[PDB]
Amino acid sequence: MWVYRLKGTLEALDPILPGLFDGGARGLWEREGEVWAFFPAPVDLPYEGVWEEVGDEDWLEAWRRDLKPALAPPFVVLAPWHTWEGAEIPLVIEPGMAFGTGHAETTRLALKALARHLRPGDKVLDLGTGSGVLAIAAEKLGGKALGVDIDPMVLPQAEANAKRNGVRPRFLEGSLEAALPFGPFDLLVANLYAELHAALAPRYREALVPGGRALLTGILKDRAPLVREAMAGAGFRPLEEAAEGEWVLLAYGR
Amino acid sequence: KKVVAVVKLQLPAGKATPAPPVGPALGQHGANIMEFVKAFNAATANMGDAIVPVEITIYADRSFTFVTKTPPASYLIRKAAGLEKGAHKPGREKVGREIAKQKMPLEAAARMIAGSARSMGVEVVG
Numbered sequence A: 001m002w003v004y005r006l007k008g009t010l011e012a013l014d015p016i017l018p019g020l021f022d023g024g025a026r027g028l029w030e031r032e033g034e035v036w037a038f039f040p041a042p043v044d045l046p047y048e049g050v051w052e053e054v055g056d057e058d059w060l061e062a063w064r065r066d067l068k069p070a071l072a073p074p075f076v077v078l079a080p081w082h083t084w085e086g087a088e089i090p091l092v093i094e095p096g097m098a099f100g101t102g103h104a105e106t107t108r109l110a111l112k113a114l115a116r117h118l119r120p121g122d123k124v125l126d127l128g129t130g131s132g133v134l135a136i137a138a139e140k141l142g143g144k145a146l147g148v149d150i151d152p153m154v155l156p157q158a159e160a161n162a163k164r165n166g167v168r169p170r171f172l173e174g175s176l177e178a179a180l181p182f183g184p185f186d187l188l189v190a191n192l193y194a195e196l197h198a199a200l201a202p203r204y205r206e207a208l209v210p211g212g213r214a215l216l217t218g219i220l221k222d223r224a225p226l227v228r229e230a231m232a233g234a235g236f237r238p239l240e241e242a243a244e245g246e247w248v249l250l251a252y253g254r
Numbered sequence B: 001k002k003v004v005a006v007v008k009l010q011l012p013a014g015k016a017t018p019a020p021p022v023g024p025a026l027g028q029h030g031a032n033i034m035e036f037v038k039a040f041n042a043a044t045a046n047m048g049d050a051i052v053p054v055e056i057t058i059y060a061d062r063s064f065t066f067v068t069k070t071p072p073a074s075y076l077i078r079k080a081a082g083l084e085k086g087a088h089k090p091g092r093e094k095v096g097r098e099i100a101k102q103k104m105p106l107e108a109a110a111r112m113i114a115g116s117a118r119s120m121g122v123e124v125v126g
Ligand SMILES: Nc1ncnc2c1ncn2[C@@H]1O[C@H](CSCC[C@H](N)C(=O)O)[C@@H](O)[C@H]1O
Pocket: A099, A100, A101, A104, A106, A107, A110, A127, A128, A129, A130, A131, A132, A133, A134, A148, A149, A150, A151, A154, A174, A175, A176, A191, A192, A196, B001
């Protein structure tokens, strides 16, 4: 394949883009201060760009090969085409348009914390469910899960992931307030961010039964005090802290 | 969710493939190329052969979202004016001869739309 490299952005180059396509371009890609136009073969163009031949990959194959099962003991997070031989609890998640593919440190932190804290039969709130990964994992561990999200786009994805796992968590649009009537819960798991944890702390307390657990992650290491200060002020007991990379998970007892 | 890339492409409606630019542009960040191709093509199925600007937002766990836009102004002017590839034959050839409202995102912005057409240089009737 060939690329024709032009100085400028797509915006700046707007008048010439139809001509690139009429010349045989199959698509355009804005890069740092350049537009790359991809053609099967070079053509004579009036635009003063530069022809460069690029190496032809099978991009589907390159992507499949570098996408590996994501281990988060006791779970392995697998794409639908993955095979697995180990004894781990499989979680099948399509890597798609919803956070929670299993390839985030925070998702993995929360998966391991679930295995440490979740009692069979207990009621679990997955706050900010995204792909559904954590609510599905909670079902696999013997819990009954409610997964909520304010983003309605993820809920059909979370549903379709639940079908890949033979489980049916309850999925719901909204936030903590919309989950409240389904509680109180035995366990809350929330991979969000520090500031939202600090704001919702007192409502976390109301969401949980006495002795209920809050597993909170999505917390940047340097933002952890905001959550510690807030969960103290809401009357929680600290159970453990867990770290991976620049991220932490903080566990609290009601 | 922390954004790791915002990828701007223009692709042919209904016709994304995993070949470049889609393959390398999404692949660089590990986004699901095949899932993008499918959603893109489903979302632009009723659009003919239009150029569709598309913005892909990729997250640290390889999840992504995308937004499609309205065809480029220059594309619309050209298509409405009869300008096409192929049949350039010896002898006579004819020059060419709303989009402002489709491309506006307040009022008579059609001033550098009628003007872009003349820089093209397409004759306007009224
Ligand atoms: N105030 C709020 N209430 C409910 N959900 C929220 C929220 N703010 C953000 N979210 C949702 O929280 C999710 C965070 S990404 C977390 C996805 C998944 N639980 C995982 O562990 O990987 C996003 O889908 C986002 O839409």
